[PDB]
């Protein structure tokens, strides 16, 4: 109903900020005519696409009635709306790690500090508005909470790509001697493109710049490996929980060796075969079994006891087949 | 057992070719000392990662016995081994479309034809060895066939990234005048980095090269949009089939309105509620229901008729609950 809301507008104000800050990063990158922020104004186009996947899936997870197309309802839509955002992220912390290994073998000089720093700090205070509207991880059942942990990592992934930038734009502005047009800046780090044009005149004398320090150029790719080893540690408890539900694994709360034992202790029941337990979404566990009873008349209270021994483990969707003989 | 095999070695010879052709694209890109094939020898590192996902999933889909961790077996492992390869591909036909829109706003000249062409044609005859070992789409139930349609598109995705290269390396070698060191090549397409160094002497006379044609530089990014609109048409029938199984949709073969009608026509059965049908993997469909019968003694032949009316739609995993009264 607002920002302080109900999982619908709170994903929707944030698409109304990423879409406007991507405008503010294109307008600045045409007025100053620098074409190196067009490679960072497409950095927040992988954060508009990853807020539509969590917004389409939230529109379908409200149809829990028995459709003719799905007999359970679309309540497992928001379990794999969080499997997609944790595979679209792991295939994005792989394109960072390959782009930040090309900068090792040939470096790249940032040209305009105090304009990059005028957008890095001005973008760090948008992605520390995502990380504060996502309470239960904003320090002031698990069906939709599992979805908005997929778009918590697409905001933690971009409030760490605006601390690499701000710690980079300060090192260049406070320590880099640079190379203006002429007067002995040889760049003995970087391969100089104007190589066959400095041979005309050894100009005046020893006017040594030598581009200042050399270790500075390898600081934007050293930090894009410490950023990658943090997201591939934080996204692994999401890629395990919401992808063992879809494989229909027995939930962690439930042990099989104390259900098949307790079904055989009920009087009248001889044995139990073909027992299945899976988890639909969150705390809705569904269980079925076969039972070979003996008396075809007393199957009115013996079903009440078997319904109870599933009731004392928290599972309610029961179905049993009395194979009479 | 060999290449002509059993889904195990046939995925495994191809990882023993992509790993060796990535060696042949690094050795050439250090002897000629060109650092522009290191950006294409990491093009086949998204085709070693996408042949391990289909090889880990194939090792787990052979455990169809009832584990204590999964009561159904790991037979749905190779249904989402093909959901990952069709989301790792769609998040890779998105990084192409953003890298081939930076080349529109500033072009980029290829430097060495007849070495790129010596690797493009030499890599087109590796990815038309993937597209011929993948019969049922190599023109000379659906459980594992759904997996090796995920790594058919990671080979069709790289036998179309070696026809862009070979149609590009022929246009430069047959039509590009180039710009050698000196003698009036102004590049009136490309922003010339040696701009303040040509002002020394208007050298001899009108010796016009002007870098030859201008439309040639926009031919490697025109074709990486016709390549993207083909993979996002071919991968959509895979991303729909193997992601409506995991949401437990009623299969396309089965209509609900001719099962709940036919259960009520069986004598003795009064009505039917709580009917569920989903698909485990391939042609294994599982169905459960509740039935309010009337006679607690005649539940020995009425179950045989209800087992038949599910048998005449191809589904066999049945479980029914007679709610006697």
Short mmCIF file of C-alpha atoms in Angstrom, two decimals, chain A residues 71-304:
data_model
loop_
_atom_site.label_atom_id
_atom_site.label_comp_id
_atom_site.label_asym_id
_atom_site.label_seq_id
_atom_site.Cartn_x
_atom_site.Cartn_y
_atom_site.Cartn_z
CA UNK A 71 -4.46 -28.68 -9.28
CA UNK A 72 -2.36 -27.33 -6.38
CA UNK A 73 -2.45 -23.64 -7.23
CA UNK A 74 0.41 -21.42 -8.27
CA UNK A 75 2.01 -21.33 -4.82
CA UNK A 76 5.34 -22.74 -6.06
CA UNK A 77 5.75 -19.75 -8.39
CA UNK A 78 7.58 -17.76 -5.70
CA UNK A 79 9.93 -20.61 -4.87
CA UNK A 80 11.48 -20.56 -8.35
CA UNK A 81 11.25 -16.85 -8.63
CA UNK A 82 14.19 -17.06 -6.23
CA UNK A 83 15.97 -19.83 -8.08
CA UNK A 84 16.19 -17.60 -11.16
CA UNK A 85 17.57 -14.60 -9.25
CA UNK A 86 20.26 -16.79 -7.70
CA UNK A 87 21.41 -18.17 -11.07
CA UNK A 88 21.13 -14.85 -12.83
CA UNK A 89 23.41 -13.61 -10.05
CA UNK A 90 25.91 -16.48 -10.22
CA UNK A 91 26.14 -15.94 -13.97
CA UNK A 92 26.90 -12.30 -13.22
CA UNK A 93 29.58 -12.89 -10.60
CA UNK A 94 31.22 -14.86 -13.40
CA UNK A 95 31.20 -12.03 -15.94
CA UNK A 96 32.73 -9.74 -13.32
CA UNK A 97 35.52 -12.22 -12.66
CA UNK A 98 36.36 -12.42 -16.38
CA UNK A 99 36.20 -8.69 -16.97
CA UNK A 100 38.38 -8.10 -13.89
CA UNK A 101 41.06 -10.42 -15.24
CA UNK A 102 41.47 -8.49 -18.47
CA UNK A 103 42.41 -5.42 -16.44
CA UNK A 104 45.26 -7.39 -14.87
CA UNK A 105 46.97 -8.16 -18.18
CA UNK A 106 46.43 -4.65 -19.57
CA UNK A 107 45.50 -1.78 -17.23
CA UNK A 108 43.08 1.09 -17.80
CA UNK A 109 43.28 4.65 -16.47
CA UNK A 110 40.23 6.47 -15.14
CA UNK A 111 40.09 9.92 -16.66
CA UNK A 112 37.65 12.05 -14.63
CA UNK A 113 37.71 11.85 -10.86
CA UNK A 114 35.24 14.18 -9.13
CA UNK A 115 32.65 13.20 -11.73
CA UNK A 116 32.84 9.44 -11.18
CA UNK A 117 33.01 10.27 -7.46
CA UNK A 118 30.05 12.55 -8.04
CA UNK A 119 28.09 9.52 -9.25
CA UNK A 120 29.59 6.74 -7.07
CA UNK A 121 28.66 8.42 -3.77
CA UNK A 122 25.44 9.51 -5.46
CA UNK A 123 24.69 5.84 -6.23
CA UNK A 124 25.82 4.45 -2.91
CA UNK A 125 22.91 6.37 -1.39
CA UNK A 126 20.43 4.54 -3.60
CA UNK A 127 21.65 1.00 -2.94
CA UNK A 128 21.65 1.74 0.79
CA UNK A 129 18.01 2.44 0.32
CA UNK A 130 17.42 -1.05 -1.03
CA UNK A 131 19.31 -2.58 1.88
CA UNK A 132 17.10 -0.76 4.39
CA UNK A 133 13.65 -1.44 2.89
CA UNK A 134 14.36 -5.18 3.11
CA UNK A 135 13.68 -5.72 6.82
CA UNK A 136 14.56 -9.11 8.40
CA UNK A 137 17.92 -8.10 6.95
CA UNK A 138 17.55 -4.39 7.75
CA UNK A 139 18.62 -4.29 11.37
CA UNK A 140 17.04 -1.21 12.92
CA UNK A 141 5.62 -18.96 6.70
CA UNK A 142 8.80 -18.90 4.56
CA UNK A 143 7.03 -18.60 1.22
CA UNK A 144 7.55 -14.97 0.20
CA UNK A 145 10.52 -14.45 2.51
CA UNK A 146 12.42 -16.83 0.25
CA UNK A 147 11.73 -14.57 -2.76
CA UNK A 148 12.94 -11.26 -1.29
CA UNK A 149 16.33 -12.73 -0.47
CA UNK A 150 16.88 -13.04 -4.18
CA UNK A 151 16.53 -9.27 -4.63
CA UNK A 152 18.41 -8.59 -1.44
CA UNK A 153 21.50 -9.95 -3.15
CA UNK A 154 20.87 -7.86 -6.23
CA UNK A 155 21.11 -4.85 -3.97
CA UNK A 156 24.04 -6.08 -1.88
CA UNK A 157 25.61 -6.75 -5.25
CA UNK A 158 25.30 -3.04 -6.08
CA UNK A 159 26.12 -1.49 -2.73
CA UNK A 160 29.49 -3.18 -3.09
CA UNK A 161 29.96 -1.98 -6.65
CA UNK A 162 29.68 1.55 -5.25
CA UNK A 163 32.33 1.12 -2.57
CA UNK A 164 34.85 -0.17 -5.11
CA UNK A 165 34.14 2.97 -7.15
CA UNK A 166 34.36 5.44 -4.26
CA UNK A 167 37.56 3.88 -2.88
CA UNK A 168 38.94 4.05 -6.42
CA UNK A 169 37.99 7.63 -7.31
CA UNK A 170 39.75 8.87 -4.18
CA UNK A 171 43.07 7.17 -4.88
CA UNK A 172 43.28 8.71 -8.37
CA UNK A 173 42.31 12.19 -7.19
CA UNK A 174 44.73 12.11 -4.25
CA UNK A 175 47.57 10.10 -5.79
CA UNK A 176 48.02 10.03 -9.57
CA UNK A 177 50.38 12.37 -11.41
CA UNK A 178 48.72 11.82 -14.78
CA UNK A 179 49.89 12.50 -18.32
CA UNK A 180 48.83 15.78 -19.92
CA UNK A 181 49.53 16.60 -23.57
CA UNK A 182 53.33 16.77 -23.75
CA UNK A 183 56.17 17.50 -21.34
CA UNK A 184 57.62 14.09 -20.43
CA UNK A 185 54.95 11.67 -19.29
CA UNK A 186 56.13 8.32 -20.62
CA UNK A 187 53.62 5.97 -18.84
CA UNK A 188 56.01 3.15 -17.82
CA UNK A 189 53.06 1.03 -16.71
CA UNK A 190 50.66 1.35 -19.63
CA UNK A 191 51.44 0.64 -23.32
CA UNK A 192 51.53 4.10 -24.85
CA UNK A 193 49.55 4.40 -28.12
CA UNK A 194 51.46 7.51 -29.24
CA UNK A 195 54.69 5.55 -29.42
CA UNK A 196 56.10 6.53 -32.82
CA UNK A 197 55.34 10.23 -32.23
CA UNK A 198 57.54 10.93 -29.19
CA UNK A 199 60.68 10.33 -31.28
CA UNK A 200 60.60 13.79 -32.87
CA UNK A 201 62.44 15.84 -30.21
CA UNK A 202 63.78 14.85 -26.82
CA UNK A 203 61.94 17.94 -25.78
CA UNK A 204 63.59 20.00 -23.01
CA UNK A 205 65.33 18.02 -20.21
CA UNK A 206 64.60 15.52 -17.43
CA UNK A 207 61.01 16.52 -16.58
CA UNK A 208 60.12 13.15 -15.04
CA UNK A 209 56.49 12.37 -14.36
CA UNK A 210 56.42 8.67 -15.37
CA UNK A 211 52.64 8.63 -14.70
CA UNK A 212 53.15 8.78 -10.93
CA UNK A 213 52.69 5.52 -9.05
CA UNK A 214 52.19 2.22 -10.77
CA UNK A 215 50.26 0.07 -8.27
CA UNK A 216 47.21 2.33 -8.45
CA UNK A 217 45.94 0.97 -11.77
CA UNK A 218 45.63 -2.55 -10.31
CA UNK A 219 43.24 -1.51 -7.51
CA UNK A 220 39.94 -1.62 -9.33
CA UNK A 221 40.63 -5.24 -10.40
CA UNK A 222 42.03 -6.37 -7.05
CA UNK A 223 38.77 -5.39 -5.37
CA UNK A 224 36.51 -7.04 -7.95
CA UNK A 225 37.80 -10.39 -6.72
CA UNK A 226 37.20 -9.64 -3.04
CA UNK A 227 33.68 -8.52 -4.05
CA UNK A 228 33.06 -11.75 -6.00
CA UNK A 229 34.18 -14.04 -3.18
CA UNK A 230 31.59 -12.41 -0.90
CA UNK A 231 28.55 -12.79 -3.15
CA UNK A 232 29.40 -16.42 -3.93
CA UNK A 233 29.46 -17.06 -0.18
CA UNK A 234 26.22 -15.26 0.59
CA UNK A 235 24.18 -16.62 -2.32
CA UNK A 236 24.97 -20.27 -1.60
CA UNK A 237 22.49 -20.69 1.32
CA UNK A 238 19.77 -19.43 -1.06
CA UNK A 239 20.68 -21.65 -4.01
CA UNK A 240 20.50 -24.71 -1.73
CA UNK A 241 17.24 -24.10 0.11
CA UNK A 242 15.10 -23.15 -2.90
CA UNK A 243 16.42 -25.93 -5.12
CA UNK A 244 16.02 -28.88 -2.79
CA UNK A 245 12.35 -27.99 -2.47
CA UNK A 246 11.88 -28.38 -6.23
CA UNK A 247 13.60 -31.77 -6.23
CA UNK A 248 10.98 -32.87 -3.65
CA UNK A 249 13.45 -33.73 -0.90
CA UNK A 250 12.17 -34.82 2.50
CA UNK A 251 12.23 -31.68 4.67
CA UNK A 252 14.93 -31.22 7.30
CA UNK A 253 12.41 -31.16 10.16
CA UNK A 254 11.20 -34.70 9.42
CA UNK A 255 13.03 -38.00 9.90
CA UNK A 256 11.72 -41.04 8.06
CA UNK A 257 13.01 -43.53 10.66
CA UNK A 258 10.59 -42.22 13.29
CA UNK A 259 7.48 -42.25 11.08
CA UNK A 260 7.63 -45.72 9.53
CA UNK A 261 8.44 -47.02 13.03
CA UNK A 262 5.43 -45.27 14.58
CA UNK A 263 2.99 -46.34 11.86
CA UNK A 264 3.78 -49.99 12.60
CA UNK A 265 3.08 -49.54 16.33
CA UNK A 266 -0.57 -48.65 15.68
CA UNK A 267 -2.88 -51.58 16.46
CA UNK A 268 -4.48 -53.27 13.46
CA UNK A 269 -1.90 -52.03 10.97
CA UNK A 270 0.36 -54.85 9.84
CA UNK A 271 2.90 -53.00 7.68
CA UNK A 272 3.44 -49.87 5.58
CA UNK A 273 4.88 -49.55 2.08
CA UNK A 274 5.12 -46.81 -0.58
CA UNK A 275 5.52 -43.77 1.68
CA UNK A 276 6.19 -40.37 0.12
CA UNK A 277 6.77 -36.99 1.78
CA UNK A 278 7.63 -33.77 -0.04
CA UNK A 279 7.31 -30.05 0.63
CA UNK A 280 5.10 -27.85 -1.53
CA UNK A 281 6.09 -24.32 -0.45
CA UNK A 282 7.09 -23.23 3.02
CA UNK A 283 5.31 -24.93 5.90
CA UNK A 284 2.92 -27.01 3.80
CA UNK A 285 4.12 -30.63 3.79
CA UNK A 286 2.19 -33.30 1.88
CA UNK A 287 2.31 -37.01 2.75
CA UNK A 288 0.82 -40.20 1.28
CA UNK A 289 1.13 -43.90 2.13
CA UNK A 290 -0.26 -47.39 1.59
CA UNK A 291 -1.49 -49.48 4.53
CA UNK A 292 -2.39 -53.18 4.59
CA UNK A 293 -5.04 -53.41 7.30
CA UNK A 294 -6.95 -56.57 8.21
CA UNK A 295 -10.50 -55.75 9.33
CA UNK A 296 -12.71 -54.07 6.69
CA UNK A 297 -15.23 -52.99 9.36
CA UNK A 298 -12.97 -51.24 11.89
CA UNK A 299 -11.60 -48.73 9.33
CA UNK A 300 -13.28 -45.79 11.02
CA UNK A 301 -11.15 -45.27 14.16
CA UNK A 302 -7.86 -46.74 12.93
CA UNK A 303 -7.73 -43.94 10.37
CA UNK A 304 -8.15 -41.44 13.21
#
